[PDB]
Amino acid sequence: QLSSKAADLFDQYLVYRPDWLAQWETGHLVEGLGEAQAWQAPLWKALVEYTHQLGQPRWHRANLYQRFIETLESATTCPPGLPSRVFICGISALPPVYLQALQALGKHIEIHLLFTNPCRYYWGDIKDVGNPLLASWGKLGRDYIYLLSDLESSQELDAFVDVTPDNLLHNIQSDILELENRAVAGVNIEEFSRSDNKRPLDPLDSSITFHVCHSPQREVEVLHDRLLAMLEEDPTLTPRDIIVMVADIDSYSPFIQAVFGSAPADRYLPYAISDRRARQSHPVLEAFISLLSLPDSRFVSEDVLALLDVPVLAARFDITEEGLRYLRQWVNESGIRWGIDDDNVRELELPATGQHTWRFGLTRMLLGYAMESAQGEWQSVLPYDESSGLIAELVGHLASLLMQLNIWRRGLAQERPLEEWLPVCRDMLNAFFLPDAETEAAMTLIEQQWQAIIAEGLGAQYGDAVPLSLLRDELAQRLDQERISQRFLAGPVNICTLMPMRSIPFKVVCLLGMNDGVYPRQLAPLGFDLMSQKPKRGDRSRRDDDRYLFLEALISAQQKLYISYIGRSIQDNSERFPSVLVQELIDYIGQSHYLPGDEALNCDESEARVKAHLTCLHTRMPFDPQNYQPGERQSYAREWLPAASQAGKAHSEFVQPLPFTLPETVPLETLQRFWAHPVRAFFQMRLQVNFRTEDSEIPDTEPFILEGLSRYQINQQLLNALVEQDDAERLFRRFRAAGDLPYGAFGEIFWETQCQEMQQLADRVIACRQPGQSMEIDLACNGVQITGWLPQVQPDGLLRWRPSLLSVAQGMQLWLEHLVYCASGGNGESRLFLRKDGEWRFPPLAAEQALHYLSQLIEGYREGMSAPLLVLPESGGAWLKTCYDAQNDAMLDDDSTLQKARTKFLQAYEGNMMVRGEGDDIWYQRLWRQLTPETMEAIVEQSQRFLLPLFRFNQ
Amino acid sequence: KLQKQLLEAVEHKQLRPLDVQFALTVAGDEHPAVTLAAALLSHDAGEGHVCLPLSRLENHPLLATCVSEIGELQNWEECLLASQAVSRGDEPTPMILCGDRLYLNRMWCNERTVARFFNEVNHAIEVDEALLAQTLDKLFPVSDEINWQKVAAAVALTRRISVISGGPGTGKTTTVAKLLAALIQMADGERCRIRLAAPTGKAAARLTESLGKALRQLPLTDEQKKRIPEDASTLHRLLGAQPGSQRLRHHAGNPLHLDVLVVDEASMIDLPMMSRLIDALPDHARVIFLGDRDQLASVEAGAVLGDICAYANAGFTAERARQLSRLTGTHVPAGTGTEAASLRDSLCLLQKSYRFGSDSGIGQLAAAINRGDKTAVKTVFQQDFTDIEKRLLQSGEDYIAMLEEALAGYGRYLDLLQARAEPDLIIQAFNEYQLLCALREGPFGVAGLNERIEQFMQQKRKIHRHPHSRWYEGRPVMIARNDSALGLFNGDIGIALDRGQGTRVWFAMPDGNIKSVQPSRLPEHETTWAMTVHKSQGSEFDHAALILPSQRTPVVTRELVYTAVTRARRRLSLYADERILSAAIATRTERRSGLAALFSS
Amino acid sequence: EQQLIEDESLLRYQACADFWRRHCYPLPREIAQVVFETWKGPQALLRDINRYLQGEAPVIKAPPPDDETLASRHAQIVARIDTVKQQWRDAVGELDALIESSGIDRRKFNRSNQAKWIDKISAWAEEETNSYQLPESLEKFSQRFLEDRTKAGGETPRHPLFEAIDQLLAEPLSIRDLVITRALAEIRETVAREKRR
Amino acid sequence: LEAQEMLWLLQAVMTPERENTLRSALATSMMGLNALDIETLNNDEHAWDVVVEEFDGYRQIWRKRGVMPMLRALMSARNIAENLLATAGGERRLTDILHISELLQEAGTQLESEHALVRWLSQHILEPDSNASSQQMRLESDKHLVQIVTIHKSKGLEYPLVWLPFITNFRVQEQAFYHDRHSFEAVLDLNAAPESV
Amino acid sequence: AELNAKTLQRLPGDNWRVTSYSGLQQ
DNA sequence: TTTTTTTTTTTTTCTAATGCGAGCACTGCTAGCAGTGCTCGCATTAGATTT
Ligand SMILES: [Mg+2]
């Protein structure tokens, strides 16, 4: 980076400062210069001599200038081969040395300089300039005209065109051209009182208009309507005449594109965006750049799948798009987290574990292809059962990719000389990529830029080795430096940034994003540059360039000038500010004009009134009715007209009574699935609406702790093993081989704690467990036949166990199974032993009461299929547990208990910060966005009616 | 080591990369003999073979190349079993060395499961001989000679597990209807839960329709007609196979709630699904299999129906012959010798085809191809048969003649199209002629043949086509996947036409009604001017035209040509070289499995 | 040319997980028990030191020696607990006679509670010192506890074992400070290095 | 929830062939259908076909003109904006919908594939980045709003009428991090010594 | 109050363009 | 080198602090017993910030 910066400095010195280099080559110092010269003068010298040792040509332009000028100065006749005449058009800035060379060259051949001069009279170092808008923004042109005037052998004729002040814009342009000042300061009291000194401004006049918007979206949306109005107003106007200039085109590109694309056919305006970053094939470039960083990468699964996203890299290993849907879940489930192999893990100085690496996952999938997981571990690795059929061929392709990813990640590590880096890019491209009609252009561009970098390096004869991190970071910077401006004047309206030395007259000139800080654009000098210490005339800087571009844009506008900027932030409703240029412009406008009828007002009041009349404050939203009121500010988009008119109807209540007829046969699984979640059942079963949320992303790192469904499944396996009195050590080895448990001793500690916690419940279950078999359920209730199967029906009763906390839903499921068992006819009690000594116990019941409660449940199911059954088994369960009294078999009424039950219901519904509440659910959000007390009362009533027998018969 | 050598085989497209990776990982750094053995085993298992006999490991060209590295081994068994990657089943290892063969650990378990299910699990169920004979006599009138359908019915009623093999148009569905009728009529008071399954949704719907229409004709009481199965399902839906995971709703612990099960088109049943189905059956369920042994083998690795029916050639057991003679009231021939009594008795073969007579050219050609005799095939071609045709296809000028003949083949359909007829007749007409090609792409293939036929219909005025539209009226399509919402299955054809309300695709549902679907509603589909022989299974066309490519590919085999021949109802045409057809018929498909040894020992 | 990142949460968590992998993984199961009791994993470990990671590092009062590893601290604490257990083992019988003879209010110190506490402390002392957990009854047998509850102007039971228990329970026994210091240094170093990279 | 509804909408538009995804997108609150509407629409084939057709046309618009044009056409045809403004509270809903649409356009410009945008949206829904400035929720309305502001963010500001509903509420600091009264240096005590506390 | 959006009497023209032989042939 | 299938859900913090209930030793009042002072144990409830 230091070499690059110093090279840029020396290039600038060559162009602008030849005397310095002439002195430095001899070895002397320039007097009265910057402090950094002490280390810059020798280096430059040490460069010249260096390039003489290699034998390269000595000549550079700095020494060549004087010899070139002296040759033509003393030449008696014209040298052969020179062109007849030259034109210099559109260039308002040249270095003084180029002007000296062209002056010396003018003798033999004629040179015509076309200089767009905004002012008629001599305005460079006038013998502050007369006009304020010219003095402020004319630094770039003052030096140029001062240089042009100093030419000895120059014959110049002035060809100006007078401007008639019939408009505000034409008034400003005439003030600039005639080099006169119109603003009234108001020094005299007589001058300050009357406002007649200013110029009359027509109210209908709209040549110059300033517009305040909220967001860039709103800004472009207002610009589109204003352009449509300008086109409709003037028949002679055409789209190509309009130009739209932005501070940074890449920031406004998506908004410009969306706004100008959303227009309907009758309202369509053709547009063309210029100077936008050239992005011919983004994904191939990005994939290759990522491939170059292989040695440093940790090879997270998501990163490799991001490489496989590229269709070319997948086609190379014949991995189809459909196979990627499989390889996603395979990578996720097998346990691949990070690291390509054990060696890569050790290279990062982290302890080699042997699990959760691409090698581990690949071995797991291959073993699962060979051996079923039911067999067991082979080399402390559990085979992955999923990839078992012909589809497993995908593995062979994936394992073929990683192998390559291995080889290259070892090849690119070592530093190499430049000439050894030449075949790397081509080999990598042809190995990793299979080209196509579209990608070939990008691949050729990649090879061309890589070859150009290495060619410059070899031409400089760089001996020492170069790391890949250098060439990668050079190629990345070189690939995005390209810009595509070939559609500048194609015919549609031109969208493009403000570029210096491009000043073309247009009828309509629009400027966007004039916020303070965005424009002008600031690029500070390097800080050790000697030019910026003692500047001279002709030195170029970005600030002066932008300040002069703003003047060029004003001068080139022939009919209408449009200026916009963000006034208030849409997010925070803060206050932004316009650029200092826009501020000086509006100040001069308001100080030089007065609206009709304000003659009596003083200078400041009429100035503020004019400034408020020209500045337009647009609404924050498009559907604001102010847009559609009749006037000049009226919009053209009729899509937001019904919204502004407030003519839409509100969303009716989602709940609607639907017809339903109970069939003759209802499977027991249907009732169970319904009562698990009655609202979700109406959504999924009645009208078949399923709200499938997106699956979870692959975890970043290997399991450190276990929580949620992971530890729930582990506890379920462990419990089902302990109740069978099976060996737990086998299950521990199996889980450790699968990689689910944490590494090493922590896995054993977790397993021991879980073993104790599950052993308590296993002892409780074994105390009552008896050998039982399943049975068939054929039943009749309320003219409806129920057919089902009940598993594990032992002579004692229905025994169930789950490693979960005590919840009402499980009690409801057990109650349904218990009612089915009793009504079917049996002598037994139902038990459920949940974690932390949770117990749901139901004593036996007679056939009649069983059928009665089952008929009640079926009626509830029918009502649910008709309209959504508002029964929240958790919150309503809390309310009913608070209100109900088991001793008296009656629910309490006193208002204190009611308040306590409401508090309990709200706590269960909303939930704490740590645990999500019952209310946070996709199905409940659909029915209501916010819980109302009336809905609460309805929920309480229904939940009480349906859940009363559970708490009544629970013991 | 041998890794660098195995890297070369992938370049020559002899060894899959999966095989190389599996060998490198599992075999590891053992003797290169073990690595090579593992690579060859993985290759053979990928190509469809179940096992790998050690005799095969004796000098694949890669083995000849690696003879130098592996050196000379006095016993391959010793070297292999020495490594950890190979065992005899005592400890879980990726590879298993059983007898003289090698197995993948997954394949060995499935093989053993199928073997023990077909040998020991099945039993002989006993019923009254007089009552069963009376029922069958009421079902089958002719007692003058041996009726193979009656023998098959007796077999399926006697044994728990039975398989019935026969060619297309041999009356399989009718026999199954008679069987199920006699079964229901036999058990009056006991509950009989009948289940019908097929490996494909299309075959499932065909089985529903055929079994329904067959059982409705046979005289039954309202009690019996209440036990008729409602619908037939797929094997996956039967076992409740989840889409993503391999977990089954009905595992070994949770058996199926069935009394009798009927699996149609067992030829497509592969070994893994066979084992997984076997695992979910209870001990009282009677299973019936249907399929043609000569039909093209299943997709995935394995061949069950073929390996089973291989023993049917031996014949019935001595005592079983007399038993069936006593049951059917006729004389049943006896197979000589005793090799495996259970398997030989559980198999029946239907040798009579009611559809096409023996004198018809199609049957003689199918028999000659099944026998593998090229001279017989050429003799059948030379004989004066009006329903078989052959055209030489070597030069493109013969390809153009084939296209000209396909023109006349689709003639009636094209005329009914340009005459603005109703979609019902158009669909009924479209199934009269069909092209069957082996490959998918290239000059001879669905992808190429569709484009060529469309260009030929654009050259001669038959059907107007728009380039941008892509949905010109008249184009036939076939569905790629199953769709439950629209009620249309994979492998079902439809005709795109404009009846006036809009361009819509018309399908023929099994109930005879026609259903119109919008082009947007349609799932993945493809133009069906020519079908592959694989996807043509189950279908039946009035005029079929087979196209075999000039080159030599492992796809063209004996069973493929056999299926393509049996595809046609009345008229069959072939387009192939004289030498290529003979070379294909001469080579029989083999998938090496230990079943041949297991059933004998 | 420098880049700006506003959120360093990912880099910080990755450095913490790297520290956990390097240090907590090799540990034997017995030190692993003590580490697991304090923090379940790197997520919980980052939660304690998140505030201290941001900004300037905080001076730690009484920092552990630079060479003290985790095993050294574990052995030191195990030795202290072993000494206390042995002193209890030797004086398991004299304490009853000492308490009965000396004058202390038995309303505050019930005989049944005393016997239960003695039994629990004996069972704990005979238990192998796998973990740093101490029974609550040791708080009852501390010299300060006995001195707090005694007859006005009466003999107070005093034994060297009581003074040892008082000295032991004076300060908690834990590896927390050492692990926190090591992590606070290593995670910061790692984050700075990765950001420089 | 508007993010999830927009995801469902895009997911249906991408593949209108699947009835489940289309029905899921239709039944969102954003569309505003009732239960009787969905019931009748699941039975009549013509209405379902018309919906499929309009979604297929939205897919064509989405392929040709980009993202924002498709969502704009959808809002216009379904009258989403008008109905949301009519419904009580729907103004915030519509603002969030517009904001998500702008973000989707910005992210779809860079991503060339149409499916990559759905992948990006699902990814962002899974792990929302609160620290992101662009993802900050915009102001609901430009009308008069009661400004709830934290005490730290109110430094140097000015407010005519001020409320402090919970000024009395406090917390006791458990952690031991202080400053030495002599050296004036930040001191963290990894031990819970009560002096530090 | 009554609200009405404006309409466009004169349609903008995209006749003007710059093309090569390839665009004309296409 | 050819290809078949299938749709559903599962979990939820931890530490701490108190209120009461049961048991017990002491002790004062009229040797036992009621009060009292105390203490341990189980269940119940509360709370966890700020650019
Ligand atoms: Mg201030």
Author numbering:
A (entry chain C): 126 to 252, 294 to 1121
B (entry chain D): 2 to 60, 65 to 606
C (entry chain B): 149 to 345
D (entry chain B): 591 to 787
E (entry chain B): 886 to 911
Which sentences from the paper describe this structure?
The switch from the destructive to the recombinogenic mode is triggered during RecBCD translocation along DNA by recognition of a specific octameric ssDNA sequence called Chi (crossover hotspot instigator; 5′-GCTGGTGG-3′). These exemplify two contrasting mechanisms for control of DNA break repair in which the RecBCD complex is either inhibited or co-opted for the benefit of the invading phage.
We next solved cryoEM structures of the RecBCD-Abc2-PPI complex bound to a tailed DNA substrate. From this class, a 3.8 Å resolution structure of RecBCD-Abc2-PPI-DNA complex was solved. Consistent with biochemical observations, this location suggests a role for Abc2 in modulating the late stages of the DSB processing reaction catalysed by RecBCD (i.e. Chi recognition and associated conformational changes mediated by a 'latch' structure in RecC, or the subsequent loading of RecA protein). The binding site is also close to the interface with the helicase domains of RecB, and to a tunnel between RecB and RecC which has been suggested to allow exit of a recombinogenic ssDNA loop (the site of RecA loading) after Chi recognition. Abc2 is bound to RecC in close proximity to both a 'latch helix' which is thought to control conformational changes in response to Chi, and to an 'alternative exit channel' in the RecBCD complex which is thought to accommodate a ssDNA loop in the post-Chi state (i.e. the recombinogenic mode).
